[PDB]
Symmetry: D4
Subunit: 141 residues, 8 copies
């Protein structure tokens, strides 16, 4: 049973290869400052595409990285930016699956969000997000 | 931050509109038979796209419909076909999120599975799947 | 083994047709504005009757629409109205299943709530509840 | 927002009154035999309406009686009857929420199922179901 | 294989008969004021012993009454009074299973708590705890 | 609000001291053979009272031992015996929280079950139940 | 398949013998004061290694202890210290698994955290952490 | 406060670097046959260390791979081997977290298991496990 074409629509995604590349770059940037993090890349659909649990990363950081990446891709903004939204709209954080805490950054294709990169377990979420941005940076270019 | 094109890939979906069309057709065919079903359309990725709870449908049927659709699109075959696999490999049913019980059917686009339609709560699963096929049949075309 | 009249009671609900009709128009009103949302219709009992996942809706928005619709019908108010109740009873949002965030609006039958319509994923929850109202408006009159 | 009448619909329930005294009857008929059970009454929609945890009942039996009652009303048959269906359709038991094991019995209103009574934690499920019938027997008559 | 005596210990509970009597009176206190609640009795150990779901009670109120009764018995105080603890200790509410919101009240036996009574879904939590207190008030005497 | 006398009832338990001694003996028994297990003592109510995760125990064994203990206490029988009930009543294992697998063994107080001892992750469940019985063997006495 | 040696890394843990010793000590440091607590010891990886439910401990306290111990080891600080971090970072508490509430205290080996000890159920969380420190105090020395 | 060294023990693990290498090798093996799989590496403790979701892999496969990795490392044997155990001990598959289905294969250091590699979503689990073995094979050497 085949659908075509007016009932079809398309979406754009990172390849696994790209997601892995970005994720490993986020680890590597954290490694470079003697930091131990977990990293997640979450699709815009968002299934998780990649997780990496770093050596000596805190046990909480795994799921925390996942949810940051989810939150970033959901609204196409850094979670550090998104946490500022809770001043006016404090129940945004009651939306299931979210974590409004610095360390997730969106990846876009022609403007539109396709993935989030989440990092957790550094001394602060601001440093987390710096490593997440380092992850995004190796794409494409 | 912007990936291009060697680290991007495309995937194909039903529109909400087509998913709703095929869903509501499946209800229609069930109601033609004086039966009360729940119907789910589930993406290949598979997020649920559409649920409809029939009037007077059993309370079990809602989730049952979803997992039938999920199972159909996961392996690109009717759940009645897939249920037959359990004789040789009984532990396939222990894969999370699956239900190996007639009433789920795949939709394809260009050969690849793009959605599953799942029906539950007719007096038996062979009837469920009959209405599932009827929903699929209103695509494309 | 059959029960008789005094120990039976009745309740009132949208038909599936009604709930589908309302949800689809809420999507229709969103896509008019270039907006990509998920819509849920949840019963007073509240099982979910309908979900629709709009093309290009954020992945968080599906569950979010659901809980809004649940929260609206639970208290027979807009969730935007209900969110302001948190100022002096802050632990209302600790009630399981609830999301106190604009985008849910109740549907009534002689004054008593029978359904909720939740929308999520527009630029603001205020816009969500506008499209939620536009869904409720096609009922029916 | 007010719906009128050709997209409203009606459904019939046991009153809480009626469900409570059916549940307490099932307990009392268990305690006739020095037997210590849990009882649940689940609606057709099926929310649970009543639970009672017997003095000295096994810790497993609370949730067990819930699921038996859900299962019985879902298919409008006693769970002892339903259990025997698994010879032909073994994956019926993979439907979420269900327990295909004697101790649940349906209550009807003009013919159509409106509640299930579930009992758990007697020496046998067959004895569970006898107490469950002794629950339903104080209706309506 | 049998423990005795000196590493056995005892604990004290409401009977099911007691707890049902308390639950139904809490309903019937709410019923007199035309209002539509769910009621739970939770043991000190705390398994739930009784739930009753009121006719036309909000779908939220079932779970919510449960957790109120859990919270009351956990600390041997009315939940309205436990909610005031949150000013100086805001993360008491992050303790799993708890709901810090008026409608739960302890029953004691010589001075130590043996069950909680939780009412939810009347127009204020402060009405809920009145009905919970009415539930406890039929014990003794 | 205090209840007296005859709407109270008692129940007998292991003390923590007892439950700990039993559990640590079970570990001791396993480690004597160079076996690495997890051990749980679950009450009759059954809350878990003690868990111990052995040095080098398989990651699965922790929850397994919990459920074996739960199952043994629930029906006042060794889970190895309980597993033989499945031939004639195969859906007993569909009862939530149970694990019908050798390694759980009941503790009694004048004849009535008060705790279960659960051991997992010896090379066989039969060996598990050996260590479970050895843990119970240091009780009372 | 054997990995060696540069794909391999080591980590340090409390033994079960040590973990039980520190947990038991926390218990009877609370029992010296006639207070009734749950104690949990969670590895840095963090699996739970030990739980003890104290005689007459509140039902909330079991899981409360677990998450305190988890929180403490995750950031290698007392949870009384950690809770103060919420003033300028309110959403730290939205990290899954965590409880930011006094009663959890880290154990280190060569400066690096290897376990957390969690106590819940005293009159206050500060008294919990006192007993938790008394647990940790029987190491190493 | 510092534990030392009698209270302390070591465990061996794959580095993240090693786990990623193996996971990517399993994918690359599958992609050579035109097969779209998910891969997971799970520690013996068993946290998941690495997940990769392959392009066009079935949605079920992600968690399936996770549980296969978990199951393999739990008993230090291929899951295809472990599935054969269910003939004699059929309730082994009722152990939480497990999937007794070909596609998981253990990795050892000095003969003791340190990780599992799980692959799901090829034409058969036997082929899954071939790709899993090819993942393991690039370690060490
Ligand atoms: Fe974190
Ligand atoms: Fe069904
Ligand atoms: Fe949303
Ligand atoms: Fe049972
Ligand atoms: Fe409520
Ligand atoms: Fe095991
Ligand atoms: Fe606590
Ligand atoms: Fe699979």
């Amino acid at each position: 049973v085949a659908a075509r074409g007016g009932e079809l629509t398309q979406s754009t995604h990172l390849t696994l290869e790209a997601a892995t590349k970005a994720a490993r770059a986020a680890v590597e940037a954290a490694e470079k400052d003697g930091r131990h993090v977990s990293v997640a890349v979450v699709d815009r659909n968002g299934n998780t595409l990649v997780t990496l649990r770093g050596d000596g990363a805190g046990p909480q950081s795994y799921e925390s990285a996942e949810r940051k990446a989810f939150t970033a891709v959901s609204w196409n903004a850094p979670t550090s930016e998104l946490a500022k939204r809770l001043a006016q709209a404090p129940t945004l954080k009651d939306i299931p699956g979210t974590l409004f805490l610095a360390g997730g950054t969106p990846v876009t294709a022609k403007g539109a969000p396709v993935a989030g990169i989440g990092v957790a377990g550094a001394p602060s979420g601001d440093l987390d997000e710096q490593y997440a941005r380092a992850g995004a940076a190796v794409l494409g270019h």
